[PDB]
């Protein structure tokens, strides 16, 4: 039960630097790739006494990736696998999405080719990308659009980075956001939020960090990969593999777009006091102040939820945690749905990295739902791509590439629609 | 279940390319001796042993003096590991000999018999890099190694 | 992989780009012999983008030198890191232009820019991947922007699909060194908004007053100025050149600052200036770097940002920064100053975090901003023009050179129009 | 044996300082002649004896 | 790792990038007492980024000899103490106490500045160093009688994305393609190993200097 | 069992240079002629203890042969089995094959024929010419002419150097060309093509080395011939020997043009990376782009294909190996002939030489394969000689040499015949 | 430059018509001996300078 992982533009191939840097560790894997299982799911046994992941970190510019190759994993990886351009996107959608795109994902998916048949109970993919930015949302959607033709039942996890609605580092990204939803809206199977500033938010409250750079923020979104994927690596008193996701929080076609969380975030000197129990982290988990995109739950209804167990969990208890939320009447479910939960429960405790700022808890919850309050990040980008484009702002770089006025007049409705479904959903 | 599924044979059993990679050219010489004047015909005669450090593999060749009454073979012993001991064969499948059980590089002391499935080959000499290794790995004396 | 060619037309170009080599190389540690000395090996993974290998360690920088008076020629190579240009490169006239835009722009470049498109060419095919081009030129002088204007326009034909950065200096009345500025100016102006893509504004008047105010120097010679101008020509293109968290090349650049296809003149800045006397008082984190960026004192032209509105605005930061400490910051300004900011454009300001500060430094910024205030340096300049042309004076050097009434006009004309479409965004 | 670099195969046609002045030797002996020559030799003469 | 190499390292990498660690030290204790908490102290080295370029057994070396219990039950890191060293790498704080002191312009024990013009490591074996010697010398012989440039061929092993690239640096196996294939000359395994010994880098041992290769296999003069 | 083989021109005994480099190595012979059963098909061991080649090098420039002379491989080669005249040929066909081809031909093979003496089980002949010189195409085509009416029964293989389509090295290539194959055809039993731009490729695009030179393209020729010949030398599971190419892969007397592939190459660094199984090194041989000749397999279709195999190799998968090779669509074999491989299988592994660019691997795949493409090339290099013609260009250095024009005109109906057939039978 | 556009040769190195003027027509006349005898023919030989 295999799994490969595709890492697209700056953000993507930054946060999969800390995913590997966290994998290594989970299977006692030195960054030279020798051990002095369960890795069987990452890394394809190569050799004698060598591990090579199932990654390709792919890129138009090369100042990111040739990082890699000659950071302290060099010889981790294939050099074959990560893929440099020349030149960058610039944070233009229709730059990599029909110039410099149409040259490299026949190289991409071609290599995708020979990673799969390598592999035995292939179950899916999963890609990272950051929809403000040119590469990561305008070639990450081409890429997973030949993706889709060409495997189609392979479910497809996007774990994307969102623009927030405050905090932000670009002025054409309501651009790129529209046009890239436009795509995977209708490709990827389950849709992973995340924000930049919610995620600034944890750090600052649970952490104490009161500066977090960008090392921390990519740290702590590893765990969340690393948790909901562990019930594979690991058997657990109740599994739940990458397909249990694809039909228990996807309600209609359209609607996949998951809020996560995750607690204890918890600091080492603070590990000591709290009494870490089952009945508390999961209420840690559903407070609105603990998921990572910015958005206020208690204005929707909860569509369902999903709840990833680690460590020293006993599954009495969950059943009587999961009883007490469904007791509390300040959040609430839809009508459509009495039965509300995808219980999971794992063996293997988190896992800590020296020099990382999380502690060594005995047990952790990374919760994964699904509610009508991400329409409001819907509705909230679509207002602020509507100001920019009455005055046709920036678009003579997206139609100056060779694009038309159709593709944003066509896309604009599109999340017309989708809002249209999440107020229908909600009734 | 990986085997049925396609996966390398190689890669299914393990730990063959590192001890190849290191030992890739690395070959043990010995001559022996084989003593057989006690039967009822033919005559004892000399024969050379390669030990393939890189499989941990036996292969017996004969030599050949002019004028021999001997048709020339060039090999006498197939290159495969040697069983060392006597075990229960199974009709079926041919055994499959665990290296515990195989003849190791360790055991060759130049003045001792070798079982060589029943013939006992007295091996008495051995070359200039083979001293050397025996010395440098296994801590041997210069005077065994005459 | 990503390459930048560099012109430097005209006295005020070649001086000054001079300063820009002798900064450029130290920051990747290369000697005036041209060879390396540095330390840290990240001053070597990226020099292809201003230099090229020559022969057993000799890095020779990717420049073009090029005006119409020997003096200059001489001069530039005068001083240390004269040695290091390829002699070949130096491509110049003879006769002079004299501050005359019609000379620089139909008579020399008619048989000079010939020869200099020749070696631009050569270094242009010599490389693997264009990222544009580094024009440094001024736009009062005559062989400045008149020959410098044409070459350029020269260009936009043969690497239409390429970048163009043209750093240039501006006149204002208090710092009013020739007589025929006017003319000069709106004549260059009026092709700079047709081919090349973006280019920062400077002036001598705003360099002044950073040199008395904030680095309290007493006698500034053309020396500091220069080596001020130096600093954020050599910031602009640190994404290039070294790792950064959130990396930003120059086309990243681009489509971030540009709306609208004429919009292209923005002003600059640095961050921190700080006079050798209050150096070791002060404190030096993100915060600091802002309020000093954003002081409307620290721009480097003469055009008051308070006085008009933000289209964009940028800020390149360099050093171990926390990318939160960053945002934050950016985004206090733009709900504090809410009126100096456009309403139909949300999240005005763009954030870029570079890994290596400048040589010494521990962290710096650069400012970049698009703003609608410059429309004034367009109009005392427009009037000037208009209130010398009312009187045919100084024309019969024109007139007497190729040019005839119409484009004079013509270039009014223009320049017109392109201040009432900055009036008209806010 | 000769097997040096310094000397050569008998089917050399590349050029040798001074086979033009031997006689009735084989090759490779010919190529000691003139390296180390014998008293007896014009090659030793024309080098190493006193004018 | 012991603690001088870890240290040296760690000063090595803040001189080289210019890496201001105060700001992440400062915020973890609000107080200004010092003595940040061992799991901060290495949050905020991660925060710096120094966790690429050092070894976490590094960290772990530094952290262990800079804690100090500032309780029988409690234990904590000054880093103030640790800070001070940090600042001594640039200059000499406090200055204004004592004029007659003459402080160096950088810190030459760290720097090399012609790692990529000459060889500075030495071998300990003399004989070792004398072979060394010897086959240079050979090799610098043939090179300048047949006329063949040594770093062109180097250029193309290092520039490609298909090999794990540092800048004056080819690992062994290309090494050895260049070494007979592209250029003539042959060269056995006894001085291969030892043409890689003199110029392996210690930081990645697995890396070997053409640059410095080059320049003293013949000189560019 | 013994071989022997002639190399003739300036590439003929440069490859000659790499092969039997290879040679003394692998059999762990000193490159002096002594070491410190299986050789018995290459050198002729002699007196005390020194083994001498079984081949000679001829060629009318005395350059290249006393270079050999006097470089490493003094002690190896005998005086006499080094053959070299007073002036070459000049890429004169005409200037080769009669004015110096006479003078020197029947001391060469009045040398080979006290070759064949020592030996006793000769299996046949090699060749080793480069068709577009003046001494491979001259002293070659009358060679192979004389050697027919001598033994005649036996086989022989040639590894002919063909001229690329767009690279080219001399201008009167077109003409030396037809000039041979016009008696190429009715001598050689087997001839296998080799290009000089498709391994140009090779050396860029597998061992990436951007600027490669000869010595890199002879040492993998000189595995090819080491691995369709290691039948002879070593044992193995399932041995194929020399004179099966003449009855597995020749329908016709006059189809017998061959192409050739070798898999894996990969360098030093990319090697314990990658999963070596006979799965992809099966597959690896069949793609375009790892031919040694210049020219798409997929255009025509294979008569016939012998597979051969060395090292660590059990007989299972390569069955299952190329069972799906039959069931993919993008390559179509010729229904006259449903069954058309044959699998080799031996049991050394490929020695590489030291300080080489390939890797010590486990296994390797050479494939010797039929085609129709190959129809392609005598067109396309046909089509060029008409247009020298119509101009009698060049031609004045011919018949002044001797020959005539009827040869221009009939060698170019000769080849005429040989398209037909190459479209008929593909048909 | 000069060069290009048009100088005297003599006027860009300089410092000739100097020493010309000063020392027109003064030569140092020298009598040199070579001997040579230890080669394989010829003897030594008497020249000038
Ligand atoms: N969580 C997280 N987000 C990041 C990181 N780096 C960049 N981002 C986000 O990525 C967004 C823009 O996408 P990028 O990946 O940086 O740019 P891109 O997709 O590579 O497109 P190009 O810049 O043209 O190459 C920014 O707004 C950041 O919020 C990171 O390290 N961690
Ligand atoms: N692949 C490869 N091709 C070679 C090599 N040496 C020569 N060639 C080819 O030989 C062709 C030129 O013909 P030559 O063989 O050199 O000339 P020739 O046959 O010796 O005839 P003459 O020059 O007249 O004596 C070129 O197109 C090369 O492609 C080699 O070492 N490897
Ligand atoms: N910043 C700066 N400006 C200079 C320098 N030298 C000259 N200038 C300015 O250049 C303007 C005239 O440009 P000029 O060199 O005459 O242009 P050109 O004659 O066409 O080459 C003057 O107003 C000066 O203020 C210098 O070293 N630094
Ligand atoms: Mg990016
Ligand atoms: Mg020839």
Known sequence: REVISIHIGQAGIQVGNACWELYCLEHGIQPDGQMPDAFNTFFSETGAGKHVPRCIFLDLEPTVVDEVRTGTYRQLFHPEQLISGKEDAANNFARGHYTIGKEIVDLALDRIRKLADNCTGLQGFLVFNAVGGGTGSGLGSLLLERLSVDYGKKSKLGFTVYPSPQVSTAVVEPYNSVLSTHSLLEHTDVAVMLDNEAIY?????????????????????????????????????????????????????????????????????????????????????????????????RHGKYMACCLMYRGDVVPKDVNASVATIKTKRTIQFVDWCPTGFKCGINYQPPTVVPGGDLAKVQRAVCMISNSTAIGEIFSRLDHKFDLMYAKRAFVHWYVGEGMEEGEFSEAREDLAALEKDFEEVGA | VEARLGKPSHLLDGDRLRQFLENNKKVLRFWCVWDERTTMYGDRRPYVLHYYLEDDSVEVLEINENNSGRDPFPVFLKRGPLPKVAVKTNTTLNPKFRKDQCY????????????????????????????????????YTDEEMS | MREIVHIQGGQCGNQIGAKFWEVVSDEHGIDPTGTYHGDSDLQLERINVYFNEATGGRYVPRAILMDLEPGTMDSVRSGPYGQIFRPDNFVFGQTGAGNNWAKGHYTEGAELIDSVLDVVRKEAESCDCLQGFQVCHSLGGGTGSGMGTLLISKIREEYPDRMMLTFSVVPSPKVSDTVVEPYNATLSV????????????????????????????????????????????????????????????????????????????????????????????????????????????????????????????????????????????????????????????????????????????????????????????????????????????????????????????????????????????? | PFTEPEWKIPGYTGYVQGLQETYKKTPVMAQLETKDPSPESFIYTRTQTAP | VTLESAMKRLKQHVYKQRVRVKDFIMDFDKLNSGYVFPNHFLSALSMAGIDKY???????????????????????????????????????PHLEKDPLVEVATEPADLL??????????????????????????????????????????????????????????????????????????????????????????????????????????????
């Open chain 1, 201 to 297: 938010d944890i750090c600052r409250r649970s952490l104490d960090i009161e500066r977090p750079t960008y090392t921390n923020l990519n740290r702590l979104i590893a765990q969340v990969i690393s948790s909901l994927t562990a019930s594979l690596r690991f058997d657990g008193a109740l599994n739940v593999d990458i397909t249990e996701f694809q039909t228990n929080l996807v309600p209609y076609p359209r609607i996949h777009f998951m809020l996560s969380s995750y607690a204890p975030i918890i600091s080492a000197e603070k590990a000591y006091h709290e009494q870490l129990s089952v009945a508390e982290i999961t209420n840690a988990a559903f407070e609105p102040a603990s998921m990572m995109v910015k958005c206020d739950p």
């Open chain 2, 104 to 139: 190791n590089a360790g055991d060759f002391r130049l003045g001792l018999f070798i079982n060589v499935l029943g013939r006992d080959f007295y091996l008495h000499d051995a070359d200039t890099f083979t001293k050397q290794w025996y010395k440098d790995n296994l801590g």
């Open chain 3, 190 to 426: 009026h092709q700079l908004v047709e081919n090349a893509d973006e280019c920062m504004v400077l002036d001598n008047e705003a360099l002044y007053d950073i040199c008395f105010r904030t680095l309290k120097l007493t006698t500034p010679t053309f020396g500091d100025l220069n080596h001020l101008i130096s600093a954020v020509m050599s910031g602009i293109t640190c994404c290039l050149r070294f790792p950064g968290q959130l990396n930003a090349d120059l086309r990243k650049l681009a489509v971030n600052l540009i709306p609208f296809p004429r919009l292209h003149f923005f002003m600059v800045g640095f961050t921190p200036l700080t006079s050798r006397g209050s150096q070791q008082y002060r404190a030096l984190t993100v915060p600091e770097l802002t309020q000093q960026m954003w002081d409307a004192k620290n721009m480097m032209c003469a055009a008051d940002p308070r006085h008009g509105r933000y289209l964009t605005a940028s800020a390149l930061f360099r050093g171990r920064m926390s990318t939160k400490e960053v945002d934050e910051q950016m985004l206090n300004v733009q709900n504090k100053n809410s009126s100096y900011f456009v309403e139909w454009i949300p999240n005005n300001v763009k954030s870029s975090v570079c890994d290596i500060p400048p040589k010494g430094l521990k962290m710096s910024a650069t400012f970049i901003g698009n703003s609608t205030a410059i429309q004034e340096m367009f109009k005392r300049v427009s009037e000037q023009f208009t209130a010398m042309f009312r009187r045919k004076a100084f024309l019969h050097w024109y007139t007497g050179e190729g040019m005839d009434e119409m484009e004079f006009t013509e270039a009014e004309s223009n320049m017109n129009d392109l201040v009432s479409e900055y009036q008209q965004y806010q």
């Open chain 5, 54 to 92: 050092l070894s976490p057994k590094e960290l772990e070396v530094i952290c262990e000899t800079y804690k100090v219990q500032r309780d029988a039950t409690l234990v904590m890191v000054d880093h103030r103490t640790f800070l001070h060293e940090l600042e001594l790498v640039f200059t000499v």
């Open chain 5, 112 to 221: 090399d500045k012609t790692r990529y013009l000459k060889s500075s490591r030495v071998l300990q074996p003399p004989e070792r160093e004398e072979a060394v010697q010897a086959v240079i010398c050979r090799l610098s012989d043939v090179c300048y009688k047949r006329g063949q440039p040594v770093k062109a061929f180097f250029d193309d092993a290092a520039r490609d994305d298909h090999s794990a690239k540092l800048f004056g640096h080819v690992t062994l196996p290309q090494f050895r393609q260049v070494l007979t294939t592209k250029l003539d000359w042959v060269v056995s395994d006894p001085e291969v190993s030892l043409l890689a010994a003199k110029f392996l880098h210690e930081d990645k041992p697995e890396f070997i200097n053409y640059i410095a290769f080059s320049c003293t296999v013949d000189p560019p003069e």
